[PDB]
Structures are given as structure tokens and as C-alpha cells.
């Protein structure tokens, strides 16, 4: 026999995706997976969550606008991250207010009920709800990728603030264009579908091809490149930090060797201290604009002069030559040390801020991605138990091979709708 769709729930209208394989089948406006009372609880649950996520993302949008400036371009992609999730939080508010008015149409009364989900872009007031949610969701993800690009550029490649700012047109072209390139593809083959839990249109809910390729794949690709640049940035700054650490150790042994010479006598320990200072000066010079290493060259040359005058049996003159190093030491290298103490000031202020922001955005997203892959591995089974559990009231579809029982758990979908909104409140901890 095969698969069948009942005479009830027939569209005869704007065809889109074929439900359960057969053409012109479509799903009902009552979702009938969690029927009766708890569907309306989920409607109030989405409205409850959408208020709090509106009050933590739009609240930031008016907060960054008080200063506007003073947040540099390696602070910038988050102001457009929150704008992108300002829209996304508000469309779920639109879905709560409307209910089931334009998320699906009641159609005509030629058939029994006529309540069916709209598919495709044949009807207005639903493709608009796809345009502003999906485009500003994919943008919100890639702006986070841009923020990891800017973090890697400013911590791994040692780019300045203005050098990255020169590429602001290039970042906006990708971050508004790559979701813009995708949001015009979906309109071409009208893979947009409706919704019933939250009255907003989105893609990949009732299909296995749209969610896997155009929703699951781009977030997983954006996460993979995001962690790759973040892990590259954290390891480049960790190594930078080691150069400053051992250069400061060389400066410390230089300093306390000068101290132990300047309060001692005899011609024995002065040579031993000069040996250690020469080793430290060579190490600091090779650690490493040309004026700094030129100053190191003059420094180790004066160390050489002190060694020459100390091997001749002179102590007080060697002491004066040793204390003469401060004049060429303070005015040549110490300025660069304060510069590194003013520009490396500290990227941990960004490292902590990106670490917290990525930390409170990834684990809701991985949980959200976890439910996407949970939907993908079980949607085929979920549809076949639905058609078998309700084969009594309708004309009996597919009595053959109708032996499967895996009821979906309600504690998974509202988590997916939760984690779709909790990702947007991660910008309040930045401000």
C-alpha cells in the first residue's frame, strides 16, 4: 500500500513541503503532540520568557546608546550582537501576542476542520516573520564569530585598534551579508514553515533537510570557527605573556645584581655579578623598535666595559662603571617596558570579558544545538508514532509496519525554546 494522507486536513492551496512524504498533506493548527491543557501553558511560558529576555537585551540597546563612543572596535561587535538578538527576542513576543491568527490559517469550510499550518511564502504576514527572525539569528551568531576574529587579530596578530577599524566595512559586508545570502536562498525554494507552540514562522521545524543544512550546519560551522580562533587567541597571548615574564625576570636579576654590587666590596663577586648581567642582557635583547635593541646593545657594551675594567683589579672604578648603567637603562628600555605595561592596558580585561561572554553564550547554544540533533535523530520515528497512535478516528492509514512507540518528551521542546532566548541575555554581563 504505502503511505497515505486522510481526506480531512487537505490544503488545496499554496503547496510547500510534503508532509510525511505525500503531496498535499500538511500538519494541523492544533499541534497534537502535547494536546489539551499544556499547549496553552507553553504559550504563556514563551510569553513569560520573552519578557525577561526583552528586558535584558533591549535594556542593553538603550544602555550602549548613552555613550555610543568610547567602546572601540575591539569592543564593537557586541553592540550589533545585542541589536540582532533585540529583534529575535521581540519576534517571539509577536508570536505570543497574535496567538494562532497568521501563524496558520483556518482556511475554508469545504472540509471538516480546515485548520492547517501554512507552508511556503504564498501567504503574507508569515514570510515577514521568517525574514526578521532567521536573518537576525544567523547575524547574531556571525557577529560573535567576528568578535572572536577581532579578539584573535588583537591578541594573536598584535593588530592595533585602528588597523582593525580599517576593516569595518569588510566585517559588516560578511556579518550582514552571509545571513543575507542565506535569507534570500530560503525564499527561492520556499522551505519556510509555520509553528504552533510559539506563533512565529521559522525554518527546519517540520523538515529534516532545512534544519540540518541551513540551521544546524551554519551554527556548528560558526561555533567551530569561533572556538578555533578563540583557542588560537588564548594560546598566542599565553606565549606575549611568557616573553614579558622572562624579560621581567631578566630585568629583576639585572636590578638585584646592580643592588648587590652597589653595596659590596672586593674584586671577586663583581665579576660573577657582571657575568649574570651579561647573560640576562643577551637573553632580554634576543627575547624582543630598533632603538630598544640598540639600547640593549649599548647596555651589554657597558657591561663589557665594566668587565674589562674589573679584570684589571680595579673595584671603585668598576663600581662607578656599574652604577653608570642606570642613565642608559632608564631612558631607552624602561619606556618600552611601561608601554608593554600599558598595552598588554591589559587584554585580560578583554580575555575575561570574552571568556564570560562566550561561556554564557556557548553552553546555552550547545544545549540548543543538542536539542537540534535530538530532533534530527528522532523526527522520522516521532512522525510514524503520531500517524499510528491516531489511526482510529481517521480513515486508517498504513496498517502495515505501524509498530513503533517513542513518545516525545515535553521537557525537551521548551528547553529548545528557552535556549533560543537565553543566548540573547549574555550581553547584559558585558555592560
Amino acid at each position, epitope marked *: 500500500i504505502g503511505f497515505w494522507c486522510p481526506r480531512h486536513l487537505k490544503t488545496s492551496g499554496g503547496q510547500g513541503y510534503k508532509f510525511l512524504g505525500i503531496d498535499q498533506c500538511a500538519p494541523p493548527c492544533p499541534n497534537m503532540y502535547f494536546k489539551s491543557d499544556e499547549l496553552e501553558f507553553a504559550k504563556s511560558f514563551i510569553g513569560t520568557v520573552s519578557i525577561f529576555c526583552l528586558c535584558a537585551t533591549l535594556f542593553t540597546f538603550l544602555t550602549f546608546l548613552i555613550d555610543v563612543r568610547r567602546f572601540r572596535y575591539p569592543e564593537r561587535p557586541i553592540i550589533y550582537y545585542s541589536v540582532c538578538y533585540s529583534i529575535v527576542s521581540l519576534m517571539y513576543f509577536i508570536g505570543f501576542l497574535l496567538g494562532d491568527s497568521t501563524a496558520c490559517n483556518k482556511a475554508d469550510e469545504k472540509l471538516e476542520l480546515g485548520d492547517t499550518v501554512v507552508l511556503g511564502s504564498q501567504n503574507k504576514a508569515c514570510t515577514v516573520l521568517f525574514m526578521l527572525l532567521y536573518f537576525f539569528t544567523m547575524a547574531g551568531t556571525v557577529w560573535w564569530v567576528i568578535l572572536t576574529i577581532t579578539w584573535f587579530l588583537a591578541a594573536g596578530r598584535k593588530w592595533s585598534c585602528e588597523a582593525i577599524e580599517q576593516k569595518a566595512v569588510w566585517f559588516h559586508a560578511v556579518a550582514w551579508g552571509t545571513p543575507g545570502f542565506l535569507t534570500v536562498m530560503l525564499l527561492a525554494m520556499n522551505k519556510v514553515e509555520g509553528d504552533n507552540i510559539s506563533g512565529v514562522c521559522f525554518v527546519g521545524l517540520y523538515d529534516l533537510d532545512a534544519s540540518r543544512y541551513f540551521v544546524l550546519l551554519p551554527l556548528c560551522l560558526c561555533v567551530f570557527v569561533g572556538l578555533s580562533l578563540l583557542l588560537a587567541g588564548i594560546i598566542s597571548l599565553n606565549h606575549a605573556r611568557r616573553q614579558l615574564a622572562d624579560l621581567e625576570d631578566n630585568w629583576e636579576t639585572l636590578n638585584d645584581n646592580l643592588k648587590v654590587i652597589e653595596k659590596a666590596d672586593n674584586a671577586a663577586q663583581v665579576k660573577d655579578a657582571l657575568t649574570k648581567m651579561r647573560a640576562a642582557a643577551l637573553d632580554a635583547q634576543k627575547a624582543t623598535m630598533k632603538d630598544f635593541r640598540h639600547g640593549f646593545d649599548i647596555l651589554v657594551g657597558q657591561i*663589557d666595559d665594566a668587565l674589562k675594567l674589573a679584570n684589571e683589579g680595579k673595584v671603585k672604578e668598576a663600581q662607578a662603571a656599574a652604577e653608570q648603567l642606570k642613565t642608559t637603562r632608564n631612558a631607552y628600555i624602561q619606556k618600552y617596558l611601561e608601554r608593554a605595561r600599558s598595552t598588554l592596558e591589559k587584554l585580560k580585561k578583554f580575555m575575561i570579558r570574552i571568556g564570560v561572554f562566550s561561556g554564557l553564550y556557548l553552553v546555552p547554544l550547545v544545549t540548543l544545538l543538542g536539542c537540534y540533533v535530538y530532533e534530527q535523530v528522532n523526527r522520522i520515528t516521532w512522525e510514524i508514532t503520531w500517524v499510528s497512535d491516531h489511526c482510529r478516528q481517521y480513515h486508517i492509514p498504513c496498517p502495515y509496519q505501524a509498530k513503533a512507540k517513542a513518545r516525545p518528551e515535553l521537557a525537551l521542546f521548551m528547553i529548545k525554546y528557552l535556549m533560543t532566548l537565553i543566548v540573547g541575555i549574555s550581553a547584559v554581563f558585558w555592560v
Partner: antibody
Amino acid sequence: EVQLVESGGGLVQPGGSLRLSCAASGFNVVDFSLHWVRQAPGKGLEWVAYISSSSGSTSYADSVKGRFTISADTSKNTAYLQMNSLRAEDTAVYYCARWGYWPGEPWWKAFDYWGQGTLVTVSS
Amino acid sequence: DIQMTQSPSSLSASVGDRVTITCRASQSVSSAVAWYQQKPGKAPKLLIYSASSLYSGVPSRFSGSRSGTDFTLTISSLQPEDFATYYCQQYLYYSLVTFGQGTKVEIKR
């Protein structure tokens, strides 16, 4: 081509005197520092002395301090290194080496060009 | 004063094998060590300077490494001409020259 040659090796009495000459053809003695490395027969290399003709920077090893001496001149472009009170443990071969001046690559290069070396022996 | 210790005083590798030589310094000398090659009866010839750089004239099989106070000369390809004594020299100052004991490389059979 720049070369270093040594002369003066032979047989001397213990406690006597001996003069060794290292002639540098090509590069001058003022643009480089001339060192002397001694290798005992069947043992490893050990360092003896160096001279810097730019200002005068003579120095010697601890085992030969106050006993050996070294000199160099630019007019003849050679280095002289004399023996005073030779002991029996000084029988070895003496190599003449060249080391550059700080700063830059010449200092970071160690002894690049070595002499042939002359063998000395104490004759008891 | 700056003692240099060369533990593998005699290596034995066949032609085409791997040769590694390890040199250890008493003090934390900077990346200023020199590796030499002395055939029996001839003057030493420089191989590696500045503890990592390769001298012009010698083959590229020689390598120079430094990790802290440890220095390593590695000869990955052993030609029949690389049968000589190799010496480790730190050079921090003109009058602080100290050589190692030296390692003999002989044919394995």
C-alpha cells in the same frame, strides 16, 4: 683568502722560555680579537689567553695567570705569546683563533678560522 | 668557573644513523654556544654558532637547539666524513671561555 699560521714550536727545557708567533694574513689584528686554545695530547681543548689590539685587553687562564704573557702589533700583523717557567703539563698543541668584536654578527660568530697549530714539548 | 658537562663522551653509530649530543651548562648562559668538529691531527672547524644558527659552508644536516640551560647538537644523517670529535663551547665573554670534554664518534659494527 684570510689565513692564520703559527710558528715557534719545538723542544725546550722545563722551566725555560719559548716564544710563539701567530701571523694573520689578510684581515688586520685591529678588526678582530686573537685567541689561543691549547689541546693536550689525548685530552680536550682548553683556553689560554686572548689579545685585543684595539685598546689592549690582555687576559689569561687561571692556571697560567702571572706566568704567561701575550702581545700583538699591527705593523707586522701578528700576535706573540711568550713562555716563562714552563712546566711539564704544558706540553700540548697551541691553536690561534679569531673572534669578532661586539656588536653584531662577528661577535655572535665564535672562533671561525683556526691556525695550523704548533706542538710544544718539555725536554727533561 | 662556568663548568660545561658533556656526559656522552663516546658515541657509536653506523653510517646513516642518528647522532645526538647533549651539553649542559652550570650557569644560565644565554644562547651563545658553539659546536666544533676536530678530525684527528687537524684544527677544529666551527659548525653551529649562537646555539641555533648554522655556519656557512657546513652541510645542513647539523642542527642546533636550546631549551633553557640545555644545548643539543643533532646529526640526523651520518656521512662517512662525520667521524670526528665534537666539542661544546660556551662564549659569554672573551675571558670566560670554557670547552666541554668532547664526544668521539666511531663506526658501529
